[PDB]
Amino acid sequence: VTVKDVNQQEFVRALAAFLKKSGKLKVPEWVDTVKLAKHKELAPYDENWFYTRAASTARHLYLRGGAGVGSMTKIYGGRQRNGVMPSHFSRGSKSVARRVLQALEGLKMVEKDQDGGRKLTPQGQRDLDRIAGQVAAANKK
Amino acid sequence: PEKFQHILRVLNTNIDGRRKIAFAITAIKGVGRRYAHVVLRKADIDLTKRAGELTEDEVERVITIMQNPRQYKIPDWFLNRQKDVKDGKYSQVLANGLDNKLREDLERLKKIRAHRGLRHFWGLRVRGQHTKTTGRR
Amino acid sequence: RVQPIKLARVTKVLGRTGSQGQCTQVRVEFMDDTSRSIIRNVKGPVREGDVLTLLESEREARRL
Amino acid sequence: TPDIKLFGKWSTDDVQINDISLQDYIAVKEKYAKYLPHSAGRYAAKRFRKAQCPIVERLTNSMMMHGRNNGKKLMTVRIVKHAFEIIHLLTGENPLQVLVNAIINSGPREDSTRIGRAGTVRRQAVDVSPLRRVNQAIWLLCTGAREAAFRNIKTIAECLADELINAAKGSSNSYAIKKKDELERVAKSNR
Amino acid sequence: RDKLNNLVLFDKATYDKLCKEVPNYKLITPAVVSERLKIRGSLARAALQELLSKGLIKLVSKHRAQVIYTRNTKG
Amino acid sequence: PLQSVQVFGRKKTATAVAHCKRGNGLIKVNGRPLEMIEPRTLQYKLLEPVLLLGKERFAGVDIRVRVKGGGHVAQIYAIRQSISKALVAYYQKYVDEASKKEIKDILIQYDRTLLVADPRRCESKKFGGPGARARYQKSYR
Amino acid sequence: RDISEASVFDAYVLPKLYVKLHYCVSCAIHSKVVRNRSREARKDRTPPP
RNA sequence: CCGAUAACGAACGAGACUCUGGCAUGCUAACUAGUUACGCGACCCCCGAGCGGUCGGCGUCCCCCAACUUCUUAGAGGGACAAGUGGCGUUCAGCCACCCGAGAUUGAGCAAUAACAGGUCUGUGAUGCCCUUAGAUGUCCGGGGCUGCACGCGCGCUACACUGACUGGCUCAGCGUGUGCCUACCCUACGCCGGCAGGCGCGGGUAACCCGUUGAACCCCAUUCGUGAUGGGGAUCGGGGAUUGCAAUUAUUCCCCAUGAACGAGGAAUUCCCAGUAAGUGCGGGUCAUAAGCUUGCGUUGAUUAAGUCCCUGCCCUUUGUACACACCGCC
């Protein structure tokens, strides 16, 4: 039951829980006043993205062998009303995906790969998908 | 579920109790949705509630913070008033205050015979878009 | 007077009259009665084999 | 389900086309009761292949209309495999009977075609190939459920599942069965 | 003409009806409470989870968007 | 020696190459079983081959699909077509033919382009119009 | 065949109207009794079904 | 086209052709594709299953003296040809239905005679004549205008919302495009810094290698909202901050704040089109120092309905009338 075998959207639900119920990661200060990406209209409601997004980011690295900040920005996109203008694609915030990577690095979920870009390290490779067992075997539903 | 407030009056401006708390802060001139959560994030008011609830301490907690923002960690994005010019004050203007400031900077531009002022005086576009076809009222 | 509902499909599609090309003229067996033969103008796309419905079984819709 | 080809959860067997004429044009099941209302589709290529497309999916397509929503069949396929799960709660039995014995008595028996008629345009009574009835019926209830569901928050699944019951029964309480009336009514005035 | 302004929070007498009246429907949703009763609809949204205190009403299937929400489960 | 039949089915530009090995055989797209993918309203859509022929019919057949190109929905009649085609080439090449024909019947009595490639592909745009056919509105006095 | 059923009598030939229509050329052409032919054709006076 | 046939047999246009678009487990192959699946030899962490054997699976360790073309690519090929059968048809020319299957039509370019004061002298070092010719209409610097605004029309976009709005998340390309270019100049991977614009670090790239499994939007899925001109909408201005540019005043472009409009489906009209079609939807290209609401391509999501008629508009032939031949927008 790898990250794929678990129905991937109720993965990060529990992986967000993991890193909350650990009580360590390194939550910071641009936090309560963050846009998330110039992309968006409005600061996000669940006051706790980066436990749930570092979840995403970290599992994402599981699926993909290497990923830069430039990559993370790319992936969390959207359309962007410039208003009466047509919608276009704007990269996500770097700062936040970066500090997500650097923070995952603190727990040592991840590491900097060779040839540039972050990938996840064996230790983290665990915490990630350990709970995959726990999410499949939470219950069949 | 407590219907007692039946609307509220805040900061010299009429406000609606029924509307959600983040939304309610929005109405006052000088605010907007952006800054109006951030006030309710530092203040630590639970955002899942209506402006026709809360206590007098909560609503003052809003005003103390929103009227004096920088001191409660609110950075300098969410100051609409950035390097004012009449002293290098950089704070957040609210209420009629902005209408006052607004007018004063129109007055200032006008008084210094400069273009942008003339353009308000006449009633035109300031921002050089073409008014051949739009701006018809 | 007389008010039944009779369903019949003309054995052969015949033409596609009407001003704008609407009505496909049809020769329709009564269905309720084998013997009866009627000519009517239909609006929907028909063919050889398909049942259709007329309010009055008399009008025998003529050249239009 | 290898025993018999059902429909997410649903019986398509024990379903009968309750008025001959529409039979052979309503393709609820040749033997072919499709499970889903998404399908590759190419029933718009030739002319009378259009009927052989299942009345259910044929309704999803007829539902993903209107300017801001064209080609969102993923979307509306919910609505319709979402609507039927309401009907069976109210009526019981296959709500496919409620769909099929809607379209039959949602759509008329005959219609009012416009001839040129010199200048004053006296429409003529003509019967129809089960098509202008079938189709008009189909929007009229789509359009009906649609129009009812701007400014109430009514679920299109709910709003449609009104109409399909209100037209399955000659209930005179929908949008489809309220115009199925008039086209006949206009025709009667003509003759 | 269609103007429909309703109180955000149910009055106690009204709540009893929701406690009372909600048992007397089948095809329920945030709609069917906010049109029959005069509840906002976000507090209906809310009320419908409150009314799962011990499934006074029954969930057929919560679709991401629409709750889709049945009679009590009598027989 | 087991089976090793690879077969592709396409839709638009969604090449989906399935492949059937002999085993226990519980089937998966890229690296995740059929229960997910999660356009989801569809789902039965890609289960169809299973549900038609029998859960028994892949009970000695590990199938692994891979999908690139095309798009969200397309990728599914692509993978549907592939695990019906592949499964067809299975019972043909080494196993039998009668069951190949009982399969090919069970499928092609309702196609949904199961073994038949949809011959269609998109038209090009022509100058003086937003799409292929439609045209920039005519000014006119 | 409506009338041949309802007939009190048996068989029955039914009558015929013998109208001598009789058009001015204007209405003959307008209402498509004759038409308007080629120079060689104008002459060919036969009456051909 | 056949046939009736004072005609018979020919030529240009149509057609044939080219490009294109789709069937080709048929061939030739391909470290500048893919690879594929192996063989799986592994690392390998419980990434996950499993007591453990064993397995499901991304990633890699690859390389390769595997092996191969299953998809990728692009060469040779084949095929599809009203080809079969049943209607209909002067039982010809064909048309219609069905079989096998792409059913005879996937979409452009090319496009005759002959025209038209159509447009173009401002695409042409193509240019007739004419002007003008130093105070120069020769070429420029600086600025300005080409953007100006009581009104009028023309192509666009965004809305009017809850099949939707903003709040989590998952996750599917294609055609291109790129430096290092005729005179000074890109494509960009990955580090820090910053909210962001961006900034500051450093890396590959005559490219199928680097950007780049081009990691998208609708779309899809996760919560708010509750039909309020509201959270739609999102104009007009207040204020900051970046970037391009020697310089943006005449908001350059972008970001960050802040204000926060009309529009709740549009009066008289009228264009667009039939299958992967309309629509939405981004994305490339072109335009570019700076940069597009422009076009031209590209997928992607993908409908409804006509499958016929000449009822309006306009086109073809035939016969006919015609005082029209500047041709009815005529003549009188």
Side-chain angles (χ1 to χ4, degrees), chain D residues 13-71:
Chain D
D13 263 354
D14 318 354
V15 178
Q16 328 86 194
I17 298 86
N18 297 356
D19 177 335
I20 197 158
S21 63
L22 291 120
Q23 180 269 348
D24 240 18
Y25 292 178
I26 290 169
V28 65
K29 78 308 163 65
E30 287 34 33
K31 170 59 181 293
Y32 317 126
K34 272 66 150 63
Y35 276 105
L36 250 290
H38 207 279
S39 305
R42 33 217 209 71
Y43 320 124
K46 291 170 194 154
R47 202 174 176 212
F48 303 86
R49 176 156 42 199
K50 207 206 269 101
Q52 315 204 193
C53 179
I55 39 147
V56 171
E57 159 179 325
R58 196 199 162 80
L59 196 154
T60 61
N61 306 5
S62 304
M63 186 57 231
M64 69 181 169
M65 323 176 60
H66 232 23
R68 40 148 187 129
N69 342 238
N70 310 189

Coordinates of all heavy atoms in Angstrom, one line a residue, chain D residues 13-71:
Chain D
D13 N -32.8 -3.8 -16.6 CA -33.9 -4.9 -16.8 C -35.1 -4.6 -15.9 O -35.0 -3.8 -15.0 CB -33.3 -6.3 -16.5 CG -32.9 -7.0 -17.8 OD1 -33.0 -6.5 -18.9 OD2 -32.4 -8.2 -17.7
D14 N -36.2 -5.2 -16.3 CA -37.5 -4.8 -15.8 C -37.8 -3.3 -16.1 O -38.4 -2.6 -15.3 CB -37.6 -5.1 -14.3 CG -37.0 -6.4 -13.9 OD1 -36.6 -7.2 -14.7 OD2 -37.0 -6.7 -12.6
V15 N -37.4 -2.9 -17.3 CA -37.8 -1.6 -17.9 C -38.4 -1.8 -19.3 O -37.8 -2.5 -20.1 CB -36.6 -0.7 -17.9 CG1 -37.0 0.7 -18.6 CG2 -36.0 -0.4 -16.5
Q16 N -39.5 -1.2 -19.5 CA -40.3 -1.4 -20.7 C -40.8 -0.1 -21.3 O -41.1 0.9 -20.5 CB -41.6 -2.3 -20.4 CG -41.4 -3.3 -19.3 CD -41.7 -2.8 -17.8 OE1 -41.3 -3.5 -16.9 NE2 -42.3 -1.6 -17.7
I17 N -40.7 0.0 -22.6 CA -41.1 1.3 -23.3 C -42.6 1.3 -23.4 O -43.2 0.6 -24.3 CB -40.4 1.4 -24.7 CG1 -38.9 1.4 -24.6 CG2 -40.9 2.6 -25.5 CD1 -38.2 0.0 -24.5
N18 N -43.3 2.1 -22.6 CA -44.7 2.1 -22.4 C -45.6 2.8 -23.4 O -46.8 3.1 -23.1 CB -45.1 2.5 -21.0 CG -44.5 1.6 -19.9 OD1 -43.8 0.5 -20.2 ND2 -44.6 1.9 -18.7
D19 N -45.1 3.0 -24.7 CA -46.0 3.5 -25.8 C -45.2 3.2 -27.1 O -44.1 3.8 -27.3 CB -46.3 5.0 -25.7 CG -47.0 5.6 -26.8 OD1 -47.0 5.0 -28.0 OD2 -47.7 6.6 -26.6
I20 N -45.8 2.3 -27.9 CA -45.1 2.0 -29.2 C -45.1 3.2 -30.1 O -46.1 3.9 -30.2 CB -45.8 0.7 -29.8 CG1 -44.9 0.1 -30.9 CG2 -47.2 1.0 -30.3 CD1 -45.2 -1.3 -31.2
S21 N -44.0 3.3 -30.9 CA -43.6 4.5 -31.6 C -42.3 5.0 -31.1 O -41.3 5.1 -31.8 CB -44.6 5.7 -31.7 OG -44.8 6.2 -30.4
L22 N -42.3 5.3 -29.8 CA -41.1 5.7 -29.1 C -40.1 4.5 -28.9 O -38.9 4.6 -28.9 CB -41.5 6.3 -27.7 CG -42.1 7.7 -27.9 CD1 -43.6 7.7 -27.4 CD2 -41.3 8.7 -27.3
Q23 N -40.8 3.3 -28.6 CA -40.1 2.0 -28.8 C -39.3 2.0 -30.1 O -39.7 2.5 -31.1 CB -41.1 0.9 -28.7 CG -40.6 -0.5 -28.8 CD -40.6 -1.1 -30.2 OE1 -41.1 -0.5 -31.1 NE2 -39.9 -2.2 -30.4
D24 N -38.1 1.3 -30.0 CA -37.1 1.3 -31.1 C -36.3 2.7 -31.2 O -35.3 2.7 -31.8 CB -37.6 0.9 -32.5 CG -36.9 -0.4 -33.0 OD1 -36.3 -1.1 -32.3 OD2 -37.1 -0.6 -34.2
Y25 N -36.9 3.8 -30.7 CA -36.1 5.1 -30.6 C -35.6 5.4 -29.2 O -34.6 6.2 -29.1 CB -37.0 6.3 -31.0 CG -37.4 6.3 -32.4 CD1 -38.2 7.4 -32.8 CD2 -37.0 5.5 -33.4 CE1 -38.6 7.5 -34.1 CE2 -37.4 5.6 -34.7 CZ -38.2 6.7 -35.1 OH -38.6 6.8 -36.4
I26 N -36.2 4.9 -28.2 CA -35.7 5.0 -26.8 C -34.8 3.7 -26.6 O -35.4 2.6 -26.4 CB -36.8 5.1 -25.8 CG1 -37.4 6.5 -25.9 CG2 -36.3 4.9 -24.4 CD1 -38.7 6.6 -25.1
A27 N -33.5 3.9 -26.6 CA -32.5 2.8 -26.4 C -32.1 2.7 -25.0 O -30.9 2.8 -24.6 CB -31.3 3.0 -27.4
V28 N -33.1 2.5 -24.1 CA -32.8 2.1 -22.7 C -32.0 0.8 -22.6 O -31.0 0.8 -21.8 CB -34.1 2.1 -21.9 CG1 -35.1 1.0 -22.4 CG2 -33.9 1.9 -20.4
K29 N -32.3 -0.2 -23.4 CA -31.5 -1.4 -23.6 C -32.0 -2.2 -24.8 O -33.1 -2.8 -24.8 CB -31.4 -2.3 -22.3 CG -32.6 -3.1 -21.9 CD -34.0 -2.4 -21.9 CE -35.1 -3.3 -22.0 NZ -35.2 -4.2 -20.8
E30 N -31.2 -2.2 -25.9 CA -31.4 -3.1 -27.0 C -31.3 -4.5 -26.4 O -32.3 -5.2 -26.2 CB -30.3 -2.8 -28.1 CG -30.3 -1.6 -29.0 CD -30.9 -0.3 -28.4 OE1 -30.7 -0.1 -27.1 OE2 -31.5 0.5 -29.1
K31 N -30.0 -5.0 -26.2 CA -29.6 -5.6 -25.0 C -28.8 -4.6 -24.2 O -28.5 -4.8 -23.0 CB -28.8 -6.9 -25.3 CG -28.1 -7.6 -24.2 CD -29.0 -8.1 -23.1 CE -28.3 -8.8 -22.0 NZ -27.7 -10.1 -22.4
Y32 N -28.5 -3.4 -24.8 CA -27.5 -2.5 -24.5 C -27.9 -1.4 -23.5 O -28.2 -0.3 -23.9 CB -26.9 -1.9 -25.7 CG -26.6 -2.9 -26.9 CD1 -27.2 -2.6 -28.1 CD2 -25.9 -4.1 -26.7 CE1 -27.0 -3.5 -29.2 CE2 -25.7 -5.0 -27.7 CZ -26.3 -4.7 -29.0 OH -26.1 -5.6 -30.0
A33 N -28.0 -1.9 -22.2 CA -28.1 -1.0 -21.1 C -26.7 -0.6 -20.7 O -26.0 -1.4 -20.0 CB -28.7 -1.6 -19.9
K34 N -26.2 0.6 -21.2 CA -24.9 1.0 -20.8 C -24.9 1.3 -19.3 O -25.9 1.7 -18.7 CB -24.5 2.3 -21.5 CG -23.8 2.1 -22.9 CD -24.7 1.5 -23.9 CE -24.4 1.9 -25.3 NZ -23.0 1.5 -25.8
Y35 N -23.7 1.1 -18.6 CA -23.6 1.4 -17.2 C -23.6 2.9 -16.9 O -24.2 3.4 -16.0 CB -22.2 0.9 -16.7 CG -21.9 -0.5 -16.3 CD1 -21.2 -1.3 -17.1 CD2 -22.2 -0.9 -15.0 CE1 -20.8 -2.6 -16.6 CE2 -21.8 -2.1 -14.5 CZ -21.2 -3.0 -15.4 OH -20.8 -4.2 -14.9
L36 N -22.8 3.6 -17.7 CA -22.5 5.1 -17.5 C -23.3 5.9 -18.5 O -23.7 5.4 -19.5 CB -21.0 5.3 -17.5 CG -20.3 5.7 -16.2 CD1 -20.7 7.1 -15.8 CD2 -20.5 4.7 -15.2
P37 N -23.4 7.2 -18.2 CA -23.7 8.1 -19.2 C -22.6 8.9 -19.8 O -22.8 9.6 -20.8 CB -24.7 9.1 -18.5 CG -25.0 8.6 -17.2 CD -23.8 7.8 -16.8
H38 N -21.3 8.8 -19.4 CA -20.2 9.2 -20.3 C -20.2 8.0 -21.4 O -20.4 6.9 -21.1 CB -18.8 9.9 -19.9 CG -18.3 10.6 -21.1 ND1 -17.7 10.0 -22.1 CD2 -18.9 11.8 -21.6 CE1 -17.7 10.8 -23.2 NE2 -18.4 11.9 -22.9
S39 N -20.0 8.4 -22.7 CA -19.6 7.5 -23.8 C -18.9 8.2 -24.9 O -19.3 9.3 -25.3 CB -20.8 6.8 -24.4 OG -21.6 6.1 -23.5
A40 N -17.9 7.6 -25.5 CA -17.1 8.1 -26.6 C -18.1 8.9 -27.5 O -17.9 10.1 -27.7 CB -16.5 7.0 -27.4
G41 N -19.1 8.2 -28.0 CA -20.2 8.8 -28.8 C -19.8 9.1 -30.2 O -18.7 9.7 -30.4
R42 N -20.6 8.7 -31.2 CA -20.6 9.3 -32.5 C -21.9 9.0 -33.2 O -22.0 8.4 -34.2 CB -19.3 8.9 -33.3 CG -18.8 7.5 -33.1 CD -17.3 7.5 -33.1 NE -16.7 6.2 -33.6 CZ -16.8 5.7 -34.8 NH1 -17.4 6.3 -35.8 NH2 -16.1 4.6 -35.1
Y43 N -23.0 9.4 -32.5 CA -24.3 9.2 -32.9 C -24.8 10.4 -33.6 O -26.0 10.5 -34.1 CB -25.2 8.8 -31.6 CG -24.4 7.9 -30.7 CD1 -24.2 8.2 -29.4 CD2 -23.9 6.7 -31.2 CE1 -23.5 7.3 -28.5 CE2 -23.1 5.8 -30.4 CZ -23.0 6.2 -29.0 OH -22.3 5.3 -28.2
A44 N -24.0 11.5 -33.8 CA -24.2 12.6 -34.6 C -23.5 12.5 -36.0 O -23.4 13.5 -36.7 CB -23.6 13.9 -33.9
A45 N -23.1 11.3 -36.4 CA -22.5 11.1 -37.7 C -23.6 10.8 -38.8 O -23.7 11.6 -39.8 CB -21.5 10.0 -37.6
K46 N -24.3 9.8 -38.7 CA -25.5 9.5 -39.5 C -26.7 10.0 -38.8 O -26.7 10.4 -37.7 CB -25.5 8.0 -39.9 CG -24.4 7.5 -40.8 CD -24.4 6.0 -40.8 CE -23.1 5.4 -41.4 NZ -22.9 4.0 -40.9
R47 N -27.9 9.8 -39.5 CA -29.1 10.4 -39.1 C -30.0 9.7 -38.0 O -30.5 10.3 -37.1 CB -29.9 10.8 -40.3 CG -30.9 11.9 -40.1 CD -31.5 12.3 -41.4 NE -32.6 13.3 -41.4 CZ -33.7 13.4 -42.2 NH1 -33.9 12.5 -43.1 NH2 -34.6 14.3 -42.0
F48 N -30.3 8.4 -38.3 CA -31.2 7.6 -37.4 C -30.4 6.7 -36.4 O -31.0 5.9 -35.7 CB -32.3 7.0 -38.2 CG -33.1 8.1 -38.9 CD1 -32.6 8.6 -40.1 CD2 -34.0 8.9 -38.2 CE1 -33.2 9.7 -40.7 CE2 -34.6 10.0 -38.8 CZ -34.2 10.4 -40.1
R49 N -29.1 6.8 -36.5 CA -28.2 6.3 -35.4 C -28.4 7.2 -34.2 O -28.1 6.7 -33.1 CB -26.7 6.3 -35.9 CG -25.7 5.9 -34.8 CD -24.4 5.3 -35.3 NE -23.9 6.0 -36.4 CZ -22.9 5.5 -37.3 NH1 -22.4 4.3 -37.1 NH2 -22.5 6.2 -38.3
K50 N -28.8 8.4 -34.3 CA -29.0 9.3 -33.2 C -30.0 8.8 -32.1 O -29.8 9.1 -30.9 CB -29.6 10.7 -33.6 CG -29.3 11.9 -32.7 CD -30.2 13.1 -32.7 CE -29.9 14.2 -33.7 NZ -30.7 14.1 -34.9
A51 N -31.0 8.0 -32.5 CA -31.9 7.3 -31.5 C -31.2 6.2 -30.7 O -31.4 6.1 -29.5 CB -33.0 6.8 -32.3
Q52 N -30.4 5.4 -31.4 CA -29.7 4.3 -30.7 C -28.8 4.6 -29.6 O -28.4 3.7 -28.8 CB -28.9 3.5 -31.8 CG -29.6 3.2 -33.1 CD -29.0 2.0 -33.9 OE1 -29.3 1.8 -35.0 NE2 -28.3 1.2 -33.2
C53 N -28.4 5.9 -29.5 CA -27.8 6.5 -28.3 C -28.8 6.5 -27.1 O -29.9 7.0 -27.2 CB -27.4 7.9 -28.5 SG -26.6 8.7 -27.1
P54 N -28.3 6.0 -25.9 CA -29.2 5.8 -24.7 C -29.8 7.1 -24.2 O -29.0 7.9 -23.7 CB -28.4 5.1 -23.7 CG -27.0 5.3 -24.1 CD -27.0 5.5 -25.6
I55 N -31.1 7.3 -24.3 CA -31.9 8.3 -23.6 C -31.4 8.9 -22.3 O -31.7 10.0 -22.0 CB -33.3 7.7 -23.2 CG1 -33.2 6.3 -22.7 CG2 -34.3 7.8 -24.4 CD1 -34.2 5.8 -21.7
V56 N -30.6 8.1 -21.5 CA -30.0 8.6 -20.3 C -28.8 9.6 -20.6 O -28.8 10.7 -20.1 CB -29.5 7.4 -19.5 CG1 -28.6 7.9 -18.3 CG2 -30.6 6.5 -19.0
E57 N -27.9 9.1 -21.4 CA -26.7 9.8 -21.8 C -27.0 11.0 -22.7 O -26.6 12.1 -22.5 CB -25.7 8.9 -22.5 CG -24.7 9.6 -23.4 CD -23.7 8.5 -24.0 OE1 -23.4 7.5 -23.4 OE2 -23.3 8.7 -25.2
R58 N -27.9 10.6 -23.7 CA -28.5 11.6 -24.5 C -29.1 12.8 -23.7 O -29.3 13.9 -24.2 CB -29.6 10.9 -25.3 CG -30.2 11.6 -26.5 CD -31.6 11.1 -26.9 NE -32.2 12.1 -27.8 CZ -31.9 12.3 -29.0 NH1 -31.0 11.6 -29.7 NH2 -32.5 13.3 -29.7
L59 N -29.5 12.6 -22.5 CA -30.0 13.6 -21.5 C -28.9 14.3 -20.8 O -29.0 15.5 -20.5 CB -31.0 13.0 -20.5 CG -31.8 14.0 -19.7 CD1 -33.1 13.3 -19.2 CD2 -31.1 14.6 -18.5
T60 N -27.8 13.6 -20.4 CA -26.6 14.3 -19.9 C -26.1 15.4 -20.8 O -26.0 16.5 -20.5 CB -25.5 13.3 -19.5 OG1 -25.1 12.7 -20.7 CG2 -25.9 12.3 -18.5
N61 N -25.9 15.0 -22.1 CA -25.5 15.9 -23.2 C -26.4 17.1 -23.3 O -26.0 18.2 -23.4 CB -25.4 15.3 -24.6 CG -24.6 14.0 -24.6 OD1 -24.1 13.5 -23.6 ND2 -24.4 13.4 -25.8
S62 N -27.7 16.8 -23.3 CA -28.8 17.8 -23.4 C -28.9 18.7 -22.1 O -29.6 19.6 -22.0 CB -30.2 17.1 -23.6 OG -30.2 16.3 -24.7
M63 N -28.1 18.3 -21.1 CA -28.0 19.0 -19.8 C -26.8 19.9 -19.7 O -26.9 21.0 -19.2 CB -28.1 18.0 -18.7 CG -28.2 18.7 -17.3 SD -29.6 19.8 -17.1 CE -28.7 21.2 -16.4
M64 N -25.6 19.5 -20.3 CA -24.4 20.3 -20.2 C -24.4 21.5 -21.2 O -23.4 21.8 -21.8 CB -23.1 19.4 -20.4 CG -22.9 18.9 -21.8 SD -21.4 17.9 -21.8 CE -21.5 17.0 -23.4
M65 N -25.5 22.1 -21.4 CA -25.7 23.2 -22.3 C -25.6 24.4 -21.6 O -25.3 24.4 -20.4 CB -27.0 23.1 -23.1 CG -27.5 21.7 -23.5 SD -29.1 21.8 -24.3 CE -28.8 22.8 -25.7
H66 N -25.8 25.5 -22.3 CA -25.8 26.9 -21.8 C -24.3 27.4 -21.6 O -23.5 26.8 -21.1 CB -26.6 27.1 -20.5 CG -27.6 28.3 -20.6 ND1 -28.0 28.8 -21.9 CD2 -28.2 29.0 -19.7 CE1 -28.8 29.8 -21.6 NE2 -28.9 30.0 -20.3
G67 N -24.1 28.7 -22.1 CA -22.8 29.2 -22.4 C -21.6 28.9 -21.6 O -20.5 28.7 -22.1
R68 N -21.8 28.9 -20.3 CA -20.6 28.8 -19.3 C -20.3 27.3 -19.0 O -19.4 27.1 -18.2 CB -20.9 29.6 -18.0 CG -22.3 29.6 -17.5 CD -22.5 29.6 -16.0 NE -23.9 29.4 -15.6 CZ -24.4 28.6 -14.7 NH1 -23.6 27.8 -14.0 NH2 -25.7 28.5 -14.5
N69 N -20.9 26.3 -19.6 CA -20.8 24.9 -19.2 C -20.8 23.9 -20.4 O -21.1 22.8 -20.1 CB -22.0 24.5 -18.3 CG -22.7 25.7 -17.6 OD1 -22.8 25.8 -16.4 ND2 -23.4 26.5 -18.4
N70 N -20.4 24.3 -21.6 CA -20.5 23.4 -22.7 C -19.4 22.5 -22.6 O -18.2 22.8 -22.3 CB -20.5 24.1 -24.1 CG -21.5 25.3 -24.2 OD1 -21.7 25.9 -25.3 ND2 -22.1 25.7 -23.1
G71 N -19.6 21.2 -22.9 CA -18.6 20.2 -22.8 C -18.1 19.8 -21.4 O -16.9 19.4 -21.3

